[PDB]
Amino acid sequence: AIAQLATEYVFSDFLLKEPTEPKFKGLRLELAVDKMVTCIAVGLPLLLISLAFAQEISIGTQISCFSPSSFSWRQAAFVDSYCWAAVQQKNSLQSESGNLPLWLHKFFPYILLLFAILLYLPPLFWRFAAAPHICSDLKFIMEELDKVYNRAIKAAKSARDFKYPIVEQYLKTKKNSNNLIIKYISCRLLTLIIILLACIYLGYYFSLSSLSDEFVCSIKSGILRNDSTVPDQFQCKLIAVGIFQLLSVINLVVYVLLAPVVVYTLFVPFRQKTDVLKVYEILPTFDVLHFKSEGYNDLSLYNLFLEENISEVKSYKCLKVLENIKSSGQGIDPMLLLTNLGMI
Amino acid sequence: AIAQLATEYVFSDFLLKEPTEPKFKGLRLELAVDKMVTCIAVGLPLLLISLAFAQEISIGTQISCFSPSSFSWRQAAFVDSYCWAAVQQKNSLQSESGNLPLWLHKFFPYILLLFAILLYLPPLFWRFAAAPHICSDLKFIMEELDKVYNRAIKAAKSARDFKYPIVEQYLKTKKNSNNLIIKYISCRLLTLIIILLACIYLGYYFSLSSLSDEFVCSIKSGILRNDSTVPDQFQCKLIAVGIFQLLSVINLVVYVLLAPVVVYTLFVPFRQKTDVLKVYEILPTFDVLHFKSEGYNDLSLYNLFLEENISEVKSYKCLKVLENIKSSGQGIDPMLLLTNLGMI
Amino acid sequence: AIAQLATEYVFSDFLLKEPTEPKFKGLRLELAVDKMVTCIAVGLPLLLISLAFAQEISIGTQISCFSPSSFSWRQAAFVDSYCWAAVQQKNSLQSESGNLPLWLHKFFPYILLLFAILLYLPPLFWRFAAAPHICSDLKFIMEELDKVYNRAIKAAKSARDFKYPIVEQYLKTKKNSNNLIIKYISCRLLTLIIILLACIYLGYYFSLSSLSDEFVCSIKSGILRNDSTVPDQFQCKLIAVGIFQLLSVINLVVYVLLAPVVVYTLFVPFRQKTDVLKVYEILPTFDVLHFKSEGYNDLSLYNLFLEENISEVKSYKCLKVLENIKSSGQGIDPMLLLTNLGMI
Amino acid sequence: AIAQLATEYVFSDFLLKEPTEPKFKGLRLELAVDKMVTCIAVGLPLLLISLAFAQEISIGTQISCFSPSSFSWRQAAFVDSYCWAAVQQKNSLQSESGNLPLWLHKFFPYILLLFAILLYLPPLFWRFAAAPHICSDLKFIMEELDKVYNRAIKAAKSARDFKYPIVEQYLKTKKNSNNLIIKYISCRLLTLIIILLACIYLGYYFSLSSLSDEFVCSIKSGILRNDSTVPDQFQCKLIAVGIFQLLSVINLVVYVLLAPVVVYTLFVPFRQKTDVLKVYEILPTFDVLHFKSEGYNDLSLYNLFLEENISEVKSYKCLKVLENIKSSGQGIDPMLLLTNLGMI
Numbered sequence A, B, C, D: 001a002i003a004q005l006a007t008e009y010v011f012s013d014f015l016l017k018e019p020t021e022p023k024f025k026g027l028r029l030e031l032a033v034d035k036m037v038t039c040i041a042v043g044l045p046l047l048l049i050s051l052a053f054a055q056e057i058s059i060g061t062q063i064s065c066f067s068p069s070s071f072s073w074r075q076a077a078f079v080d081s082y083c084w085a086a087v088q089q090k091n092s093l094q095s096e097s098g099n100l101p102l103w104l105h106k107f108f109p110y111i112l113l114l115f116a117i118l119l120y121l122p123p124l125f126w127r128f129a130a131a132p133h134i135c136s137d138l139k140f141i142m143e144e145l146d147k148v149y150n151r152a153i154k155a156a157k158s159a160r161d162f163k164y165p166i167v168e169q170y171l172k173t174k175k176n177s178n179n180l181i182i183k184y185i186s187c188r189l190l191t192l193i194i195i196l197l198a199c200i201y202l203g204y205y206f207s208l209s210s211l212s213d214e215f216v217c218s219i220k221s222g223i224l225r226n227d228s229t230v231p232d233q234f235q236c237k238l239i240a241v242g243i244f245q246l247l248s249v250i251n252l253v254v255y256v257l258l259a260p261v262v263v264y265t266l267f268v269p270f271r272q273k274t275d276v277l278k279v280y281e282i283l284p285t286f287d288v289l290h291f292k293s294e295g296y297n298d299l300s301l302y303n304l305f306l307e308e309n310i311s312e313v314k315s316y317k318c319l320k321v322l323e324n325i326k327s328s329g330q331g332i333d334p335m336l337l338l339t340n341l342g343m344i
């Protein structure tokens, strides 16, 4: 039913499932905006496919040819099925709009499924190629941040009663390499191109005259070519073509609204803001150097992933509340850190 | 069946599922009133869609055109399907009420699903954008309250046998920022606007003459335009239009009753009452300062979320019972706190 | 529905399920490229089979013979079923394209299923014959790497405050044996041959005239051979043949794009690059000798499997970050290793 | 659907499920070749049964008798059902090929299911009679091997810083008894005989003229015997007989390819090679005596089961890597064993 399709595709965790494995425990591995874009671009065409053939919106068979009254039920069924299979056969049918509109009307669900698959492909390539590496690197970075926070609080407590910046060096090294950012931009660009092509196709499909679904059909090949009792042609109409056009314009609207989001996603350096690591600069055990901005490198992408999935880090949360309290400046950062006692 | 739909949509945890993740363990992340509003506004139109096409209420096909007796079954089926697809084609049909009523009668389930999706969108935006931040902040606040309660009871026990207000400073800082409250008000306002538009549409749909479902249909395009055996027109009726109007007025009543709730929700400062933190003011380790009221800021929203999901805090429950006992004044707050022995 | 099939076969973990057993905990046991190739080559033909007979794309029965009007419904049904069963019987039918096109049109789903099964066979043979051995060997190798890393860090810590290369000897011994690599190459080659044969078949099927689906059928055997009221022949058409050809060309395109991937897979020594063990050469407890390259031996395959599933090793990750930091050369490898404190 | 059947029967763990009980944790209890043979021989005929009546390959009803035009739909249905039930009644029908072909055409699914059940019976008898005993014995043997390995490594460590061969005596005793091997050979031989009988039946079924499915049917018993309006006979055809023959030849090919595998399985002593226990002979605590070869006794079968499910033993894996390293001979077996430190 329509409501069942809605529950499956919008109100359920459709493509929102976290990786089912212990390797990525709590790691999104995909930005929220990218996940939203993929979920829409994939589950919208599927939802429209399901809707267009819902038991309520669908009168019945997808084509009716209006055989003569003399024709029996199965003769008329032969006519309808023959014309359905003959939309491909150009000789059989003669339609003013041509045969491409008939092909599109017959295979619209296939085309929507193709667009959905093509849009799901780049996210899958990301999740299967560049996701494990970033997951491992980000897990190491979070562990290092937790360890340095613990060491700093222990030092502060000892004072009240190595020291090498490994994480900073690793981030600096990531500043050079750009394979991950190149893959990310390539997959986003392919998604954008697929969306644009889908928009072109949907606009063309919705621009039809709405009468191209009606085509003339001739079961006059073979032994029936010279038969007399059979009329030279029939009036066939492809039902649900109006529904297809409505859903196609809906998908076109959604995709044109979505494309600016993908373009904004492509410009990762601009998105790289609100320095996540700036909060850690007040730790004595952490060097006061952010050095993450203004670069078409994997460093900006790692900064984005950190700003996305750093809320799960207790040390980061503690430092964030310390920073927020520092806005008033009533107290002292080391005193607040010592009082917090948030090692684990 | 009707009962199955009821069990799925009203008697089950439809959209009442808690976040399936360890990050939010026991945190609602959504006020009870907001959750009720979203659940109604989403699962009502879906329930009505399912009901309108239930196997019992539905006689059968959604349109019947009453072809002549001479017409065969599949000729009549062609007529019915053609008219169903031609509700869009204005030239084919001539109805007194126009063609918009026919469009609405055909696509009412789609319109209800659209309203449900549009009403579910703002809650989803909230849960995916502003929910993680408030979850982390509120978890930190609850942990700080538990820790300060433990410290105060330990101090009392030591007396019988830092001290910095970090949580108060954090709340004071939240008094300034307003991004969360702005997002909350924006999503509530969008929900209200969607509800009002849905009410307008449902009132228009229910105000129809009830005879607009009957339209005249002409299969007279193409080779059949000059055919003689076919009548110039047919009498088609869109079945289930009365059911659609009944369910639409039901949804209109529900939404007009719900809109005052959304308006009341918009005025969060008025809702900010029954100070949750007032109970903690009797703790020696906690400063006697509430400072949370009369502000279009995130502080009021945090106060609401606390008053919502603070019952899970054992320290808060203990302080609440101490406060309630203090109404009589027979005993002493520190003595009762020491006797409680409710560290964990 | 079409969307359900898509969810099952592309958006779900179809053939992507990890081995359901404690023996292989986190071990892929199959390279990512090989898994992708198998998943495509298997779940594409199945998806096309499901699509070709979807409730929306399918008009109805797969063959209609257009019995005379005098014929009753069940007489026409007998004609259709007889011709469906007589596509095999060459005498009954006379078609210009022959009888092989009719066989193919009738049994296309069977042929796609056969290709899917034949393509799934070599992966299954691998997973049931050569997977347990490589799993055990690789688990031992990872355990040895973890143990040597722990020993080296313990030695470094002791200095700050046996020694036999068992793993290196085992890898060197693997350099000689080649049964695993021979099995891998044989299964890949069989997969490639099956893909090529499938491409040949699909090209032949798509090269048909598109009118071979229309064949002449004669129910004139037995008592009906000399019957007069029955016409000497009927015009039968195999519906969905156009859909079969469309999906067959789609599968042909996918398989021709996939075959280069399989050919590249066959050349494992070229794939053996980015020495995984090179990072471990900086450990005092590990001998400085890689000795893994330029060989049609199981050593290259083991190197590939290591480069695939070594990210799960904490010691390997730590050594990798040490290597990446060494690019700048600011610090010292032993000092960084001591500071890391990543025993477990 | 066809793809669903494929997923259930070839791509899923059909009859590949490990024993669902804690008694056999990780013990196959069935050789890989035997499991493959059983899985094929059982799930192939079931798959063919499901395929032959798939919603796509099946035109409709399994028999059509071509009643006269004067006959009504339910008169024709009576004719078809009567002939379907009268394939057994020899007097009613007169077919050139006889009545056995009609029996076979009607009950082919039953015959395939019978063959599948008969082939599944011997494996079930094994798993319910001789599997628990071998499971217990093999678990004891693995535990003894682990214990002796632990004792030997402990002795080596003590030197660096009872002694009775219970397992060897148990294996020697198993050398005498042969009940398990006799049961194994009997079940394999019964499986082979069932496969041969199935091949005979399938060859006979596929050797039919392909026109035996067409039989003459006479509804002329009872009050209708002397009725005039009813024709003396009808032309009935059993649909799907061609599909049955195709699938039967497929099953015949599979079974003839499989029978050599079963014959090779029967010769267990030849399969008994690559002495698993030879690796343990280098342990000081283990006597240097294999004494397992060249015997129609349970010892060879136990050797096969060990070679199958010994990879799960850490001590065996360690000894195997020690053996492989000994190929070069660079080091010493006791030194390598001491350095390994693989007690558990």
Ligand SMILES: CC(C)CCC[C@@H](C)[C@H]1CC[C@H]2[C@@H]3CC=C4C[C@@H](O)CC[C@]4(C)[C@H]3CC[C@]12C
Binding pocket: A197, A198, A200, A201, A204
């Ligand atoms: C997804 C991508 C590939 C879709 C590409 C656009 C498709 C949907 C449409 C939009 C405009 C279309 C073209 C418009 C006009 C003509 C001229 C005609 O004489 C032949 C077909 C041809 C050349 C059409 C082919 C298909 C076409 C290119």
Ligand SMILES: CC(C)CCC[C@@H](C)[C@H]1CC[C@H]2[C@@H]3CC=C4C[C@@H](O)CC[C@]4(C)[C@H]3CC[C@]12C
Binding pocket: A196, A199, A200, A203, A204, A207, A256
């Ligand atoms: C992503 C955005 C830009 C998509 C907007 C849809 C655009 C591309 C659509 C809307 C209307 C469409 C046009 C409608 C009609 C025709 C006439 C036909 O003979 C050739 C294609 C052509 C000229 C179409 C080309 C594509 C088109 C311009």
Ligand SMILES: CC(C)CCC[C@@H](C)[C@H]1CC[C@H]2[C@@H]3CC=C4C[C@@H](O)CC[C@]4(C)[C@H]3CC[C@]12C
Binding pocket: B197, B198, B200, B201, B204
């Ligand atoms: C969800 C929102 C967009 C719904 C908006 C209201 C819809 C349901 C209805 C209510 C009143 C309607 C209008 C009433 C009268 C007319 C005048 C007529 O000559 C053209 C249509 C037009 C202009 C209608 C368009 C659709 C309309 C605006």
Ligand SMILES: CC(C)CCC[C@@H](C)[C@H]1CC[C@H]2[C@@H]3CC=C4C[C@@H](O)CC[C@]4(C)[C@H]3CC[C@]12C
Binding pocket: B196, B199, B200, B203, B204, B207, B256
């Ligand atoms: C949220 C609350 C206010 C909704 C209450 C429903 C109201 C808005 C409904 C109920 C009856 C409706 C009217 C019924 C009939 C017509 C005549 C038509 O030619 C134009 C629209 C118009 C004038 C409708 C406008 C909307 C309407 C006034």
Ligand SMILES: CC(C)CCC[C@@H](C)[C@H]1CC[C@H]2[C@@H]3CC=C4C[C@@H](O)CC[C@]4(C)[C@H]3CC[C@]12C
Binding pocket: C197, C198, C200, C201, C204
């Ligand atoms: C999967 C593998 C086995 C498929 C092999 C190719 C199949 C699909 C096709 C492609 C070309 C075909 C051949 C083309 C021409 C002829 C000549 C004709 O007089 C008899 C059939 C015969 C000999 C065909 C047999 C089937 C054939 C070989």
Ligand SMILES: CC(C)CCC[C@@H](C)[C@H]1CC[C@H]2[C@@H]3CC=C4C[C@@H](O)CC[C@]4(C)[C@H]3CC[C@]12C
Binding pocket: C196, C199, C200, C203, C204, C207, C256
């Ligand atoms: C893997 C790649 C190479 C596959 C590409 C498809 C090729 C092999 C296909 C496409 C068109 C096909 C041809 C189409 C028509 C005929 C005529 C027929 O009488 C014999 C087979 C023959 C000659 C086919 C042989 C195979 C063929 C050449």
Ligand SMILES: CC(C)CCC[C@@H](C)[C@H]1CC[C@H]2[C@@H]3CC=C4C[C@@H](O)CC[C@]4(C)[C@H]3CC[C@]12C
Binding pocket: D197, D198, D200, D201, D204
């Ligand atoms: C599974 C086992 C039992 C199958 C045994 C073979 C079956 C399928 C077939 C193969 C050959 C067949 C026989 C061939 C010829 C005749 C002679 C005829 O006048 C009576 C039936 C009889 C005697 C057939 C009986 C059934 C038969 C034995």
Ligand SMILES: CC(C)CCC[C@@H](C)[C@H]1CC[C@H]2[C@@H]3CC=C4C[C@@H](O)CC[C@]4(C)[C@H]3CC[C@]12C
Binding pocket: D196, D199, D200, D203, D204, D207, D256
């Ligand atoms: C396991 C292997 C050997 C099976 C190979 C199938 C063999 C046994 C099949 C293939 C063709 C079959 C023959 C086909 C036709 C007839 C004629 C009939 O009047 C008696 C049975 C008889 C003589 C069949 C006996 C069995 C048969 C020889």
Ligand SMILES: *[C@@H]1O[C@H](CO)[C@@H](O)[C@H](O)[C@H]1NC(C)=O
Binding pocket: A222, A223, A224, A225, A226
């Ligand atoms: C049909 O009859 C015409 C008469 O002109 C003839 O040309 C044609 O070949 C016939 N077709 C068939 C299929 O017999």
Ligand SMILES: *[C@@H]1O[C@H](CO)[C@@H](O)[C@H](O)[C@H]1NC(C)=O
Binding pocket: B222, B223, B224, B225, B226
């Ligand atoms: C139908 O016949 C009329 C007669 O006036 C003619 O004008 C019209 O073009 C014909 N239509 C078709 C589709 O042939």
Ligand SMILES: *[C@@H]1O[C@H](CO)[C@@H](O)[C@H](O)[C@H]1NC(C)=O
Binding pocket: C222, C223, C224, C225, C226
């Ligand atoms: C049909 O009648 C013809 C007349 O020539 C005869 O040859 C043939 O044998 C008959 N067929 C049957 C099945 O009785």
Ligand SMILES: *[C@@H]1O[C@H](CO)[C@@H](O)[C@H](O)[C@H]1NC(C)=O
Binding pocket: D222, D223, D224, D225, D226
């Ligand atoms: C049918 O009529 C015949 C006439 O010869 C007679 O012999 C036979 O008994 C009748 N059968 C029945 C069932 O009445």
